[PDB]
Amino acid sequence: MITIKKGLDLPIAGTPSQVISDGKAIKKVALLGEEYVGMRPTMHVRVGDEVKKAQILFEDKKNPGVKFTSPVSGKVVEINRGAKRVLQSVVIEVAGDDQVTFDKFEANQLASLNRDAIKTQLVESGLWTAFRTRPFSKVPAIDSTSEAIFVTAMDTNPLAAEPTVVINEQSEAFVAGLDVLSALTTGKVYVCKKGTSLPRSQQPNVEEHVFDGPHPAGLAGTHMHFLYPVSADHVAWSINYQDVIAVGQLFLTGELYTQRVVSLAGPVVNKPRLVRTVMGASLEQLVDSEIMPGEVRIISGSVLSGTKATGPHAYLGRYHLQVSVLREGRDKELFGWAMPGKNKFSVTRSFLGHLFKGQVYNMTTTTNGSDRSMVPIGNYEKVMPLDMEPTLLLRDLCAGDSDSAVRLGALELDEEDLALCTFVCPGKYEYGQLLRECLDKIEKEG
Amino acid sequence: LKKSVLAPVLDNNPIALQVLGVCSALAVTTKLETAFVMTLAVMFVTALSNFFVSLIRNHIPNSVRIIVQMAIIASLVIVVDQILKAYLYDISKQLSVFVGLIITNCIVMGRAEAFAMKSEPIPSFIDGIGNGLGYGFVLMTVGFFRELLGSGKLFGLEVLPLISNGGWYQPNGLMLLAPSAFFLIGFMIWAIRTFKPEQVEAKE
Amino acid sequence: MEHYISLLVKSIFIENMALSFFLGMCTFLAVSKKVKTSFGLGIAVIVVLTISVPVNNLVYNLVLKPDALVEGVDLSFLNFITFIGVIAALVQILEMILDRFFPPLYNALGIFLPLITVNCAIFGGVSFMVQRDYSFAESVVYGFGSGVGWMLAIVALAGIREKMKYSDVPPGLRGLGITFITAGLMALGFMSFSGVQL
């Protein structure tokens, strides 16, 4: 039992009810081209050309061999390109049920498979893009092998789902995916979970570790820091639990598994709950007639690290297992900075809201204040459980310093790991973007 | 001709650009008389040393080059010191250590290494004169400001009447202390690099 | 032990070689971008000063002191040349000893030795010693303390200049002007030990 003591559990209105109910019919899916880190696509489809399930839509130039396949069958209707012809999404009208099928095995021989056979089947089916590597949070090369694979069987994000509710539905697929992963990994598999009981794989290669505390703890970065510290020499892969269910279903049935169970919740959702959906579903079609009237923001993922789902990016991400909707706040307040906050959340104790425990806050999307320089009153240390000096590393990221940030531990971090430091900043900085800048420079100077 | 003389005043200044020469500038600029005497001594020593190292530039042994150059520089500085203690005794008492520190002053040795070893005699005297001119520009500006605002006198002549002798001025105490010279040279560098942006350093 | 501790603490803090006496400000203000390089240069300065000051004390008291050689002679005009020659020769011999006998210590601190072959800090230390008429042990302690104070000052300046990666300095003040102003503020801080008569 590793107990994380420094963190922050955001009190935000609209916690979902952990009951799975079917979702509204979806007629469009997409693959958001700007979420894959360091990708430059080679398109294998043209607007108006029919596709199948698990048919290649584009390919990578910087990562030769990694194929990004369609979630469902239908017709490509839109290929949105933004500024500098950067790919934004590939929208597919849902029609038909055709699909590309692969080889199917039994539950027994999943662990005795060949590593290269597993590699090629995952690459062809498109599930290879479920993996990401620390450092640099990139899809692994099809040639490389890792000595530690981290399965994330917990979810502590604000308004997140309950992994046990889902895994109790397909324990068979979860165990099959864990066997396949233990056959794929050179060293070990780390299933990171909470105290509750989960299905267990009978392999001596799979080890279950229990984590506990507020939420910096649900992130795979804390797990890697505490179980297998990563660097330029030691690289570790990370997959979530629904993708492991998908891997198990693939290797058991021979056909790609595209169904998901996401949590639709927020302050302005009429009835929060877990809703079934398909990979890459259209959020505007998923969440219509389900939000309160007014002006809201639809987010793909949590409020800490998500993507604003507007227009061409208004589809579910590949690595996001929830939707968050909350009202946009733009009111100018008379002395709002000087009002005693009965209804204002802060990690500081300068408002009256901290005196009332068990309170929930209907939070808008306003940035309380304006952009200013950093004055370290000590908010970053209160939300960083890792073994780093937060203020110095964040100043090294701000100052555009790559070597010093790498010495202070940038190679262990993702944009999700600095979301709380961005959250609690008085100067309204955003450290995920600066971390991605430094990591891009480090990838280049190699 | 003249441009080789006047380049170190602004375009390539010792104290402002080629950092060599800060130690005596921080110290002997309290009084304009000591600043002037230091300027003259540095000009004379640098010029004569460059001339002699140029005369013997070919026959200096590479193994003990530093000894052979320090011999000439230290002899010139020793002669200058023995002449100062005879005819200007008050100035030397306030210049006590920095008269001998002209040997380890960096201008005198940098001009002897970078120029005098590879140039003719007549241009080397001129190089020394020009570098001393820039040195003295800095010294005289800082000394003027410090002695005016800190003691109300210029070259020992009362200008702003102090309040102690029936006047209206109360002199500053920092202009006679350590930090004021740093600030004055920093703001002088700012003013110089405002008019000449080619000297502005790069962000990296 | 009461008298030698006083000299050490005095030379380190009450009269700092760099911020109180203004000796060596060229390398002080130039080689102080990194704490690593400043530490190495400070160690080299400590070593050279400790080896240099007592040897010059010996030479002075043996030859150059008035009436030391024969009665009625005063060879005190050779002070400058003798001191600078001893300092330069010691620096060169130390460079060669480190380069041939001990390659690691040479690659560590000998890299900075060509800079302090003729530095104002060491010559000023020897000059202050001949002024104050220290004994051999007092010269050793004074040299060690002066080197330690110089190292402390330059390491502090390097730490400040590394903290200042977050600053936004005007273009004309970028680099040398802001380093001058920083050293001025450091002297303003170091003026705490002004009245202590130790």
Partner: protein, 251 residues
């Protein structure tokens, strides 16, 4: 054989440079000595009241009117020696001809007192009308040196001057202020009972007092130094017995 060239060049250069250096340094030695002495001579002339300007006039008036002599601090009796070349500071430093003071005797924080001191008897004609006593004591930032001119009676003061003070230019360096120095003319060092009676009054001295002078304003820590200087030097370990002999007669 490259050694011959470097040896020959180094020897020729050394001979030339050293001939020049030794010819310059030895030639100007007496000029340097005269320039060193004339400063103290001019200071003593200023303290004594004689007006002089220029090196020639200073030297002439000093050799005319001032006659230095030696005095034994213990008994206050003149000692035989070359007073013009006596170095009292080096004498006090050297252990053979100086005594150490205990903390209860060391009022002025000097810690060392020489045995024989020098005094400059001002004289017009054969008669001596004044005596100039050098006194010194520690201030706050440095040691302060003085020249007090005591009249023939042995009590009255005719002028004071600090030539070496080294304190803050406007708080405690006001010991070199002409007004504060003119405050001293007319005070009486000893009371009717032959004890030190010079007092530095904090707050200004009563108008017309004979024993008290004003203190420095903003500087009580270098007015303490002056008072301790005078208390020690007018005592038993200073010019006490000498001033007693002067008062009795036979200056």
């Amino acid at each position: 054989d490259s050694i011959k060239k470097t040896l020959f060049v180094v020897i020729a250069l050394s001979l030339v440079c050293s001939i020049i250096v030794s010819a310059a340094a030895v030639g100007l030695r007496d000029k340097q000595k005269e320039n060193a002495a004339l400063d103290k001579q001019s200071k003593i002339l200023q303290v004594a009241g004689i007006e002089a300007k220029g090196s020639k006039q200073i030297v002439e008036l000093f050799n005319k009117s001032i006659e230095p002599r030696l005095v034994d601090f213990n008994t206050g009796d003149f000692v035989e020696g070359d007073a013009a070349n006596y170095d009292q500071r080096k004498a006090a430093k050297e252990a053979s001809e100086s005594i150490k003071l205990t903390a209860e005797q060391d009022k002025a924080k000097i810690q060392r007192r020489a045995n024989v001191g020098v005094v400059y008897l001002v004289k017009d004609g054969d008669k001596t009308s004044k005596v100039i006593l050098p006194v010194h004591g520690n201030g706050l930032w440095s040691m302060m040196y003085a020249f007090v001119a005591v009249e023939t009676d042995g009590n009255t003061v005719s002028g004071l001057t600090y030539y070496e003070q080294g304190e803050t230019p406007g708080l405690g360096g006001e010991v070199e202020n002409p007004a504060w120095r003119a405050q001293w003319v007319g005070k009486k060092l000893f009371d009717e009972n032959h004890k030190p009676a010079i007092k530095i009054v904090k707050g200004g001295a009563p108008q017309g007092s004979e024993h008290g002078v004003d203190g420095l304003s903003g500087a009580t820590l270098t007015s303490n130094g002056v008072q301790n200087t005078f208390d020690f030097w007018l005592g038993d370990m200073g010019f006490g017995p000498f001033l007693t002999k002067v008062r009795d007669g036979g200056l």
